[PDB]
């Protein structure tokens, strides 16, 4: 769909998981999609834990410099539903564990721009009715 729709979806998603009740006034359609992605990223995380001993922490110390390489790397060979969910779950980890909850700082905007540009640059919206 619309590029503005996907930019709005990613920002709303990041704001919701950031506990940033610095709300919005977006529509019903964006909100039900944010909900589906939140549910999917939790189911994803649960699979990640069932398979691995550690979680994302160590690899994200320098997320401000490497995030784009991680995403590029994530979609180097193929793009599918599961990896796109991993894409959002990484972002959810940054807002939940790395950054401060409840406030929308400049680093959130950096995370947002990064994810919005990557999601769009790579036509990620074509692999998602999920």
């Amino acid at each position: 769909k619309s590029g503005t729709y996907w930019a709005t979806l990613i920002t709303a998603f990041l704001k919701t998981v950031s506990k940033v009740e610095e709300l919005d006034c977006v529509d019903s359609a964006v909100l039900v999609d944010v909900s589906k992605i939140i549910t999917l990223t939790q189911e994803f995380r649960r699979h990640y834990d069932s398979v691995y001993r550690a979680d994302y922490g160590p690899a994200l110390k320098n997320w401000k410099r490497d995030l784009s390489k991680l995403f590029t790397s994530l979609f180097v060979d193929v793009i599918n539903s599961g990896r796109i969910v991993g894409f959002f779950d990484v972002g959810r980890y940054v807002c939940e564990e790395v950054l401060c909850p409840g406030s929308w700082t400049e680093d959130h905007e950096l995370l947002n721009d990064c994810m919005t540009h990557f999601f769009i640059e790579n036509n990620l919206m074509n692999h998602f009715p999920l």
Binding site: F44, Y48, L60, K69, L74, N80, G82, R83, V85, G86
Partner: peptide, 24 residues
């Protein structure tokens, strides 16, 4: 930089397997 690669690897694996316990 390598540790980052381990992450993308763990994510690709989980992404691919997610696809089937959700792909069914």
């Amino acid at each position: 930089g390598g540790t980052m690669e381990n992450l993308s690897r763990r994510l690709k694996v989980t992404g691919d397997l997610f696809d089937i316990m959700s792909g069914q």
